[PDB]
């Protein structure tokens, strides 16, 4: 039973037909980055809600973040559904690092996954993602799709737990405005 508002921030569409090979995409949960594996033609977008505006500019962070992962979602007969979603939390993209959390989803049509993780570092509890200092790193959400013809897209929604604190400013480049493809909104329709 959801209460407080989650905000959408990262979406990624699997490659268009006839791409049917198993694929994957990595979400940088703090920097707001979407990196598809290899050269697969993923269609990715990042939105600009307050949460992302904070995550992308706050140098130091500390606290709990709640994440909702939504999986869409295509006109597929339930009986013929065979798409699976594997997701992993990681502290790096190095093979030597192990998964911090694993979830497996195999619901037909669409799916919803709620989970949370903590950001905590050495600076009196604060962490500065990917800084050389103390080898601090960000958090990655790796999503694997076994059937990109049934699975159309991933949606990451985020929420700051009241214990979330920030400090310091990062000089970011201008943030491009949002601005379709698949009819999942009245506006798109």
């Amino acid at each position: 039973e959801a209460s407080d508002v989650y905000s959408p921030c990262m979406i990624a569409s699997t490659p268009p037909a006839p791409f049917s090979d198993v694929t994957a995409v990595t979400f940088d949960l703090i920097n707001g980055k979407i990196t598809p594996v290899g050269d697969d033609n993923w269609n990715t977008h990042i939105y600009n809600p307050p949460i992302m505006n904070v995550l992308r500019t706050a140098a130091w962070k500390s606290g709990t973040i709640h994440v909702q992962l939504n999986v869409r979602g295509a006109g597929v007969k339930r009986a013929d559904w065979d798409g699976q979603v594997f997701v992993y939390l990681r502290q790096s993209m190095n093979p030597e690092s192990y998964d911090a959390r694993t979830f497996v989803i195999s619901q037909p049509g669409s799916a919803m996954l709620n989970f949370s993780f903590d950001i905590i570092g050495p600076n009196s509890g604060f962490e500065f993602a990917e800084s050389p200092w103390a080898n601090q790193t960000t958090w990655y959400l790796e999503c694997v799709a076994t059937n990109p013809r049934q699975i159309q897209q991933f949606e990451v929604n985020m929420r700051f737990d009241p214990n979330f604190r920030v400090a310091g400013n990062i000089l970011m480049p201008p943030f491009p405005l949002s601005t379709p493809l698949l009819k999942f909104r009245f506006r798109d329709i």
């Binding site: 307050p50 310091g168 400013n169």
Partner: protein
């Protein structure tokens, strides 16, 4: 002679101290071209790199002490005749990302100082390079990539004969490094924002110049098909509605020779231009003495009936916007003995008795 070497006091892990001279450690120079413009970056490097090639009493202390509890003090020394002036800003940022914006809106945010060389002989501030702790080190600022920027906010009112140079004096002081941390309590006594409301320009003339700055400060600053944002501002945009006492820092960015009386008041977008009854609103008359360059404005709780939105839809017009605006109005007339426009910097320092309401789902654009 031999002795108990392990009992020697060679483990002096205490901070940098002594006379102010003893606590100096580096000096840098900023070339101020006689022909520069607003938004013109003057200096842009890493804070750590300041120590390269330096030979001062605490240079080696600074670079070897593993923990410092004091603050970094920086003093700018420079001047120009009263017949001119300009606006320089020095700011410390925690880090950067590729092709970062150099617009003052994002630079100022964290920690900074602003002064006009045509009135101040020098200017200084202290800061904590570790925004969420009470201690720091040279190695920490080196690997955390702390950045420093000097930028020309406003160009010269009257160009100096030759290029001039501002000099920065870097030293350590015994002021305790208190942290500056933002959090989600709905009620906060002091929420610092350092938000660059904007650069106002009032050309010389006898016209009725009116400027509007929205108090719906969330969403960042506009640009082309993009926007600028910094942490303090995006943090307050987390709430849907808010209220509190507003504390603004107003800076005379043009020379003393350019003068104008400016009225400040809180009203709404329904208030039109050329309405010669602006003083019917409760307001403040701000005049600048030739020495004076900075004025604090205070808008207490009594200036607002209710809270107001942190964001508005960018398509919203003034005639359909019930959020309050800060008006800056030329009470008399902008003039002087020399050519040049009157630039007036407006920065929201922070909010006292901050009350945040609800939760903002967010709007992609700003204004």
């Amino acid at each position: 002679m031999e002795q108990n070497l392990f009992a020697l006091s060679l483990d002096d892990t205490s901070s940098v101290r002594g006379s102010l001279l003893d606590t100096k450690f580096a000096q840098t120079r900023v070339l101020l071209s006689k022909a520069m413009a607003g938004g013109d970056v003057l200096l842009d490097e890493y804070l750590y790199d300041v120590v390269n090639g330096q030979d001062f009493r605490a240079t080696v202390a600074f670079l070897r002490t593993h923990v410092i509890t004091g603050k970094i003090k920086v003093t700018a020394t420079t001047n120009i005749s009263d017949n001119s002036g300009c606006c320089l800003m020095l700011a410390i940022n925690s880090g950067v990302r590729g092709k970062y914006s150099t617009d003052v809106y994002t630079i100022c945010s964290q920690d900074s100082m602003t002064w006009n060389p045509g009135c101040k002989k020098n200017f200084s501030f202290t800061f904590n390079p570790n925004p969420c702790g009470d201690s720091w080190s040279a190695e920490m600022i080196s690997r955390s990539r702390v950045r420093m920027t000097v930028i020309c906010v406003s160009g010269w009112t009257l160009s100096p004969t030759t290029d001039v140079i501002a000099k920065l004096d870097w030293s350590i002081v015994n002021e305790k490094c208190e942290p500056t941390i933002y959090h989600l309590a709905d009620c906060q006594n002091w929420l610092p924002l350092n938000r660059w409301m904007g650069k106002l320009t009032f050309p010389q003339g006898v016209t009725s110049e009116v400027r509007r700055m929205p108090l719906s400060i969330g969403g960042g600053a506009g640009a082309t098909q993009a926007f600028l944002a910094n942490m303090p501002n995006s943090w307050i945009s987390m709430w849907r509605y808010f209220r509190g006492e507003l504390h603004f820092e107003v800076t005379k960015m043009s020379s003393p020779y350019i003068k104008a009386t400016v009225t400040f008041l809180i009203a709404f977008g329904n208030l039109s231009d050329a309405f010669g009854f602006y003083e019917s609103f409760p307001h403040r008359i701000v005049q600048f003495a030739e020495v004076e360059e900075k004025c604090t404005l205070v808008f207490s709780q009594q200036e607002f009936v209710t809270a107001w939105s942190t964001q508005v839809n960018p398509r919203t017009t003034l005639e359909a916007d019930g959020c309050p605006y800060l008006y800056a109005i030329i009470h008399d007339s902008t003039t002087g003995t020399i050519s040049g426009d009157f630039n007036l910097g407006v920065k929201l320092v922070g909010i006292k008795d901050f009350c945040g309401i609800g939760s903002n789902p967010g709007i992609d654009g700003s204004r």
